[PDB]
């Protein structure tokens with residue numbers, strides 16, 4: 095109801111108390127996937143002329159308590175959109191007014207390096223902040239999430255309501271080797287993890303966004319801002335970066351089925367990647383890091399490995415009223431996993447143990 | 453007078469009307485050089501909780517206050533410069549950009565370096581990509597006019613006899629050659645400029661900041677902002693870029709004579725400079741430009757020549773409260789020679805020995 099949202103807004107949003115409802119417009123947006131979102135603006139020419147009204151819907155092994163807990167922190171250290179009012183059934187957020195980057199704009203060098211700078215600022219919070227919540231899992235999520243979403247997929251598949259059983263089946267086999275592949279012949283341990291960090295900040299443990307795609311990067315007047323932290327959690331730095339690199343391939347701004355376009359060749363070239371990683375490290379390490387340095391050369395090729403984590407994760411996720419062909423999209427991510435793995439091999443990036451330690 | 457500043461603030465700043473005077477603090481800052489600046493804050497925990505109160509002072513012969521104000525208001529209106537909350541004949545109320553100034557060392561940091569290149573690019577394109585760009589702003593570059601204008605202001609001061617006469621004298625001789633050196637064997641002309649642009653965006657005519665040093669770059673929560681546009685005006689893109697590069701050398705945060713430190717070797721390395729212009733070009737051109745590409749290899753070399761404009765402009769400016777303007781001048785002059793000497797030894801000069809090949 096509009097009047098109920100307007101009453102809630104004038105009561106809780108500083109400055110809105112005395113504003114007549116006739117100057118307030120509530121307009122629901124349906125670009126979301128779970129919650130009821132509204133942009134509430136003041137139409138008469140206030141620190142907050144526009145706000146984002148979020149009402150929690152029921153989400154499709156998902157824990158809403160942890161996601162909210164993480165968001166409130168990020169909101170408090172001023173990374174995520176500011177929280178103006180916070181209640182059980184929803185919240186009032188600062189409206190980040192800007193245009194979401196396009197898939198093509200990612201190719202632009204000035205845009206690329208700004209995101210790498212932002213990702214870096216977000217990554218270091220778990221090691222450079224005294225106020226970092228201790229209760230947040232200190233272990234990477236990449237594997238847990240995959241196993242968790244793998245099981246959700248099975249359930250849906252058994253629901254049998256049209257997937258490429260041959261591809262899907264091969265992916266289920268690959269998952270068994272997935273840890274050895276990322277950890278270079280060894281299964282995951284916090285031990286293996288700390289040792290790997292010694293070789294490349296790619297295996298550094300950071301607080302990752304985990305879904306930093308172009309539609310989650312808003313281009314404001316003076317900067318680009320990140321949104322949608324629903325998948326944010328500690329993870330290998332390389333995982334988060336490789337995922338961003340992958341979104342270079344997927345354009346979700348299509349109006350005809352399957353309602354997304356993909357171009358494998360669009361995956362960012364090696365030079366662009368190195369510029370990204372140089373700026374990233376300059377940010378996380380606070381020192382002059384440039385593409386010609388060996389820490390970049392190593393990390394760039396290491397980050398390539400984590401690209402498979404992205405294709406598999408969002409594949410299973412895609413399987414686990416709005417226009418999107420989730421099944422066809424999963425087929426694509428899986429397809430690209432196979433392809434990328436062949437490339438990493440032919441390029442000598444896989445297996446890790448054949449170069450990383452030399 | 454505090455009370456007077458607070459009256460003007462409460463009356464003109466949205467939301468401040470009913471705020472009690474006891475919640476407002478006016479504290480004057482003295483980092484400036486000409487005007488009376490105040491940071492007015494609401495000490496009780498508003499769109500504008502802090503503002504900048506600027507009172508216009510009398511500027512030190514050919515200075516034009518009307519053109520500067522005219523240019524600032526436009527920049528403020530298109531949201532690049534600090535917002536203007538209230539604008540009157542004797543001063544303004546500015547949006548207070550709350551952030552810390554960059555340090556001279558911080559410029560070396562790659563992530564910082566590329567944000568300024570991006571920011572510079574956004575500012576540079578306003579003369580070609582904005583329909584509302586004022587037609588009344590000079591369309592010619594200012595580099596030479598300024599050097600000549602300030603040369604004459606220097607003459608005056610020198611005669612006032614109150615400096616290194618051997619260097620100063622050599623510098624005056626070099627100026628006569630300056631146009632040919634920058635335009636590759638020719639004196640300046642608009643058509644000569646249009647021709648040069650075809651060879652490198654270094655000779656592109658843009659709206660330059662012209663004094664983009666670390667102290668004019670403030671780090672906010674989410675980005676680095678540019679301030680102090682009193683020298684802004686059309687110019688060769690390369691000049692503005694080469695000036696930023698030069699500031700890598702000079703640190704004005706020193707409290708002992710001569711109140712500034714300098715390290716010639718701190719000039720940004722070639723790789724960093726290329727990183728800079730790649731990001732710059734991508735912003736101005738809106739395409740994927742990277743250090744590998746030829747357009748960069750060439751512009752970066754061209755940009756190196758404009759460094760001499762920077763050393764000379766500010767050396768003269770220095771001649772024309774704690775600061776030793778005389779020693780600073782000797783320094784920029786000493787570096788002009790040193791740099792010009794290196795440019796020649798590197799084959800960068802003269803431009804006509806390569807640029808057109």
Ligand SMILES: Nc1ncnc2c1ncn2[C@@H]1O[C@H](COP(=O)(O)OP(=O)(O)O)[C@@H](O)[C@H]1O
Pocket residue numbers: 123125126127128129130131146175187188189190191194309310321322
């Ligand atoms: N704080 C905000 N400011 C501006 N736009 C927002 C904000 N939050 C969401 N949006 C818009 O709506 C979308 C956010 O949806 P999302 O939070 O992903 O919904 P759901 O939680 O249902 O997945 C973004 O793509 C963006 O376009």
Ligand SMILES: Nc1ncnc2c1ncn2[C@@H]1O[C@H](COP(=O)(O)OP(=O)(O)O)[C@@H](O)[C@H]1O
Pocket residue numbers: 481483484485486487488489504534546547548549550667668679680682
């Ligand atoms: N809008 C602003 N917000 C925050 N700080 C400012 C603002 N304007 C000026 N300052 C600070 O005041 C200093 C002096 O400003 P400037 O305009 O150079 O003074 P002057 O015009 O007297 O030279 C700047 O270096 C900057 O640190």
Ligand SMILES: C[N+](C)(C)CCCCCCCCCC[N+](C)(C)C
Pocket residue numbers: 125127305307309346347348408416417418
């Ligand atoms: C974008 N517009 C507004 C046109 C519509 C968005 C429709 C939902 C997007 C489908 C989910 C794909 C996301 C894939 N990952 C999670 C990998 C980003």
Ligand SMILES: C[N+](C)(C)CCCCCCCCCC[N+](C)(C)C
Pocket residue numbers: 483484663665667704705706766775
């Ligand atoms: C940083 N603090 C506030 C302590 C010094 C401010 C006053 C320093 C005097 C200006 C020095 C000349 C500037 C040279 N150019 C114009 C080339 C930057």
Ligand SMILES: CCCNC(=O)[C@H](O)[C@@H](O)C(=O)O
Pocket residue numbers: 126127128305307309310322324346
């Ligand atoms: C194209 C819209 C962007 N969406 C996403 O990144 C996620 O898949 C979205 O569904 C979400 O739940 O955040």
Ligand SMILES: CCCNC(=O)[C@H](O)[C@@H](O)C(=O)O
Pocket residue numbers: 484485486663665667680704
């Ligand atoms: C060190 C701060 C001063 N920097 C400058 O470029 C000048 O002071 C300029 O701001 C001026 O006011 O002339």
Ligand SMILES: [Mg+2]
Pocket residue numbers: 126127128322
């Ligand atoms: Mg969403």
Ligand SMILES: [Mg+2]
Pocket residue numbers: 197307308340341342343344345346
């Ligand atoms: Mg994408």
Ligand SMILES: [Mg+2]
Pocket residue numbers: 556665666698699700701702703704
């Ligand atoms: Mg400097």
